[PDB]
Amino acid sequence: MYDISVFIGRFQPFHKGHLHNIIIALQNSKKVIINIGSCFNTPNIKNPFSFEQRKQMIESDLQVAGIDLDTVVIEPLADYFYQEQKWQDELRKNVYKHAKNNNSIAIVGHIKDSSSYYIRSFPEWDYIGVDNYKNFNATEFRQKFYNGIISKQYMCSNDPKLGTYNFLTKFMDTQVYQDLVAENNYVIEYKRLWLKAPFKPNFVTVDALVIVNDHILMVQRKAHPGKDLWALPGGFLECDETIAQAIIRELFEETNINLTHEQLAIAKRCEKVFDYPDRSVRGRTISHVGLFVFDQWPSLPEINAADDAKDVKWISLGSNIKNICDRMLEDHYQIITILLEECGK
Amino acid sequence: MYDISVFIGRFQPFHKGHLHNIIIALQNSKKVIINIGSCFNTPNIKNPFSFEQRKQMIESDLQVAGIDLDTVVIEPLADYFYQEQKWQDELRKNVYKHAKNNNSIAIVGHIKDSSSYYIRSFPEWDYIGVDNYKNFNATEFRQKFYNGIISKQYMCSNDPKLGTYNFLTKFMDTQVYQDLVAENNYVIEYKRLWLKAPFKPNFVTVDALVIVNDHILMVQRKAHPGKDLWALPGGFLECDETIAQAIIRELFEETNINLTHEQLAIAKRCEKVFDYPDRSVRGRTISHVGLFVFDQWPSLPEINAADDAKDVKWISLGSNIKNICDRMLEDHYQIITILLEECG
Ligand SMILES: [Cl-]
Ligand SMILES: [Cl-]
Ligand SMILES: [Cl-]
Numbered sequence: 267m268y269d270i271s272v273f274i275g276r277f278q279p280f281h282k283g284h285l286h287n288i289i290i291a292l293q294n295s296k297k298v299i300i301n302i303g304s305c306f307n308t309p310n311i312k313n314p315f316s317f318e319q320r321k322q323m324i325e326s327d328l329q330v331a332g333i334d335l336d337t338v339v340i341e342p343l344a345d346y347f348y349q350e351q352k353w354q355d356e357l358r359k360n361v362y363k364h365a366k367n368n369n370s371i372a373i374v375g376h377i378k379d380s381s382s383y384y385i386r387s388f389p390e391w392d393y394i395g396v397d398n399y400k401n402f403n404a405t406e407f408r409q410k411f412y413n414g415i416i417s418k419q420y421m422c423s424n425d426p427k428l429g430t431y432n433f434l435t436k437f438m439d440t441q442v443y444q445d446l447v448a449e450n451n452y453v454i455e456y457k458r459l460w461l462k463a464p465f466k467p468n469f470v471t472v473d474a475l476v477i478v479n480d481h482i483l484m485v486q487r488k489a490h491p492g493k494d495l496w497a498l499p500g501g502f503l504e505c506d507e508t509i510a511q512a513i514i515r516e517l518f519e520e521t522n523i524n525l526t527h528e529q530l531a532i533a534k535r536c537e538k539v540f541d542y543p544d545r546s547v548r549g550r551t552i553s554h555v556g557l558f559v560f561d562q563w564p565s566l567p568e569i570n571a572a573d574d575a576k577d578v579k580w581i582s583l584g585s586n587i588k589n590i591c592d593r594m595l596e597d598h599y600q601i602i603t604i605l606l607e608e609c610g611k
Numbered sequence: 612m613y614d615i616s617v618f619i620g621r622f623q624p625f626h627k628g629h630l631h632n633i634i635i636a637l638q639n640s641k642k643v644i645i646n647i648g649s650c651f652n653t654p655n656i657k658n659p660f661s662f663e664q665r666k667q668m669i670e671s672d673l674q675v676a677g678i679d680l681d682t683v684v685i686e687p688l689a690d691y692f693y694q695e696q697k698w699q700d701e702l703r704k705n706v707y708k709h710a711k712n713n714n715s716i717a718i719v720g721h722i723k724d725s726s727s728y729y730i731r732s733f734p735e736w737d738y739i740g741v742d743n744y745k746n747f748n749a750t751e752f753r754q755k756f757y758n759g760i761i762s763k764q765y766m767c768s769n770d771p772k773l774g775t776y777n778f779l780t781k782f783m784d785t786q787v788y789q790d791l792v793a794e795n796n797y798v799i800e801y802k803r804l805w806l807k808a809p810f811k812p813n814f815v816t817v818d819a820l821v822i823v824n825d826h827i828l829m830v831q832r833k834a835h836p837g838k839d840l841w842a843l844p845g846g847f848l849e850c851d852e853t854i855a856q857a858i859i860r861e862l863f864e865e866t867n868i869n870l871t872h873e874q875l876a877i878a879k880r881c882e883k884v885f886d887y888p889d890r891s892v893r894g895r896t897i898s899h900v901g902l903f904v905f906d907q908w909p910s911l912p913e914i915n916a917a918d919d920a921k922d923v924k925w926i927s928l929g930s931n932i933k934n935i936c937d938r939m940l941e942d943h944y945q946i947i948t949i950l951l952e953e954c955g
């Protein structure tokens with residue numbers, strides 16, 4: 267009846283529940299646009315699979331199901347935890363890439379949660395609730411998967427040679443899988459330490475974004491989480507320092523930048539708080555990030571990695587940053603984007 | 612030697628250590644200017660005594676020393692944890708009041724971590740460093756004090772009818788003393804829970820500064836710390852909400868303010884972070900405070916105190932706020948001043 271339905275999910279991984287909702291969508295529309303959220307990020311335990319991997323998984327399960335792939339299109343969405351309007355527009359762009367001169371368009375979202383959000387943000391499309399009487403727990407799936415087990419009742423395919431089932435079987439023979447398991451164990455041990463604390467803690471960290479001649483200073487991580495990923499230099503706030511002091515302390519600690527306090531104090535543009543509750547796999551971590559801008563500087567200050575940085579580099583803006591946009595810790599690509607727009611550049 | 616020596620301290624309480632520094636100062640100079648830090652706040656466990664009480668104690672201890680009091684001058688300083696220039700301007704105000712006929716001026720520094728700050732902040736003046744005798748610990752003294760014990764070695768006077776000894780002896784019979792002991796026991800028991808855990812945890816709180824028709828919304832506190840003090844509505848950030856969400860949640864839980872979420876979102880001017888390490892006695896607590904301004908409204912919205920607020924009130928800017936400046940929780944008077952100045 268509608269020309270286009272719009273379906274949004276993370277699909278980490280795709281499972282029977284996602285499938286049911288796509289079946290409902292197609293009983294109500296001729297074509298379903300599948301938008302995959304949280305694309306263009308490096309693998310982490312919550313988001314182990316890339317856009318292309320998830321897209322391939324979905325296609326293989328829809329064929330198992332077997333839904334005609336001409337009735338299905340798949341598009342990526344980046345994370346915009348702090349810029350909802352960019353996400354809203356990015357979704358629109360995905361749809362109108364496929365929608366034609368006054369196609370009817372409906373979002374086949376969720377009668378329970380998030381419905382309110384889509385209704386308000388997309389008044390111009392209709393809404394179809396589906397929800398959602400079977401509890402397909404994405405976290406529970408991954409936890410067993412990190413323990414070597416693929417939960418069959420989630421899998422569209424019952425044959426390990428096919429579908430997402432097949433993808434996951436092969437994926438367990440990879441180095442990335444081994445890295446995910448290592449990160450996961452790190453996270454389990456970390457959380458265990460905090461079990462008999464009277465309250466769940468909100469952790470506080472700091473980062474420094476240092477721009478010198480359109481080059482960003484980035485460290486390559488030694489430790490979990492985000493082992494081997496690139497990140498802004500930063501770390502935990504200690505109990506006896508101000509945030510402003512911490513930002514500078516961690517910067518020197520990890521990069522040994524050849525600049526003085528006063529030079530950085532002159533260069534400081536702003537601090538911003540990043541508080542999206544799921545930004546970090548460790549627990550609830552809030553980051554305060556200072557922007558420091560140096561223009562027409564005589565050269566790039568000397569730097570060398572130490573403490574929890576195993577490498578450190580100046581990285582020119584434009585192509586070299588965009589290039590590692592999916593090799594960055596947590597939400598740092600978003601943080602860099604926002605500070606350069608709001609306080610930069 | 613110097614016309615003028617400058618002495619800065621908390622003096623919670625004045626002790627033997629302070630007395631000798633001033634004596635050294637009185638041979639190295641003609642007149643001492645004593646600047647008492649952290650004045651104009653409510654009593655709390657780290658700052659149990661007011662300006663007037665500390666001054667009194669100082670004077671009476673000095674007569675028992677038995678130092679001339681034309682030699683000695685005492686002035687207050689407020690806290691400005693987030694505006695150090697203001698702090699420096701009031702110190703300079705204090706000194707300039709007593710020293711403007713080109714006098715020689717030196718700062719005599721009896722605190723060790725503050726020495727560098729003073730050297731950097733006041734180069735117009737000389738700095739005389741005094742590494743004191745034994746360790747007269749203010750915290751230890753206060754803790755023994757909240758356990759019924761005056762440490763006799765700290766005291767200047769040996770007679771409980773003279774000096775700060777007399778003052779403190781008498782103070783133990785007061786309601787303020789009981790309030791502090793009660794605040795102290797809460798904190799000790801609070802910290803007890805919290806060593807249960809891998810790392811010293813920074814706490815994260817939120818507050819809301821809501822102004823309507825030039826009135827600020829304030830809560831009187833049901834619970835420790837700062838029981839019965841006036842405060843911005845606020846409390847602990849929950850793990851599953853954003854800061855902006857939490858600010859509004861605590862505001863509604865504590866005041867039941869009759870405005871919608873959307874009205875508050877439209878009124879919202881900014882959000883600032885206050886992160887002075889010793890702002891709260893509980894442990895290290897960073898607060899994010901949202902400012903909400905309704906330049907005008909038909910009336911002051913209905914408010915009803917709930918949860919950890921025992922009363923709630925619209926208090927008008929200017930004199931009504933200034934008259935409770937020393938009945939506010941922690942750094943809230945500073946927070947209010949800053950948000951109005953810069954956000955604003
Ligand atoms: Cl997980
Ligand atoms: Cl760190
Ligand atoms: Cl609370």
Ligand SMILES: [Mg+2]
Binds near residue numbers: 499501574
């Ligand atoms: Mg670090």
Ligand SMILES: [Mg+2]
Binds near residue numbers: 574
């Ligand atoms: Mg570090």
Ligand SMILES: [Mg+2]
Binds near residue numbers: 516
């Ligand atoms: Mg660190």
Ligand SMILES: [Mg+2]
Binds near residue numbers: 865919
């Ligand atoms: Mg509260």
Ligand SMILES: [Mg+2]
Binds near residue numbers: 845846847864865919
């Ligand atoms: Mg509360």
Ligand SMILES: [Mg+2]
Binds near residue numbers: 847
């Ligand atoms: Mg609360």
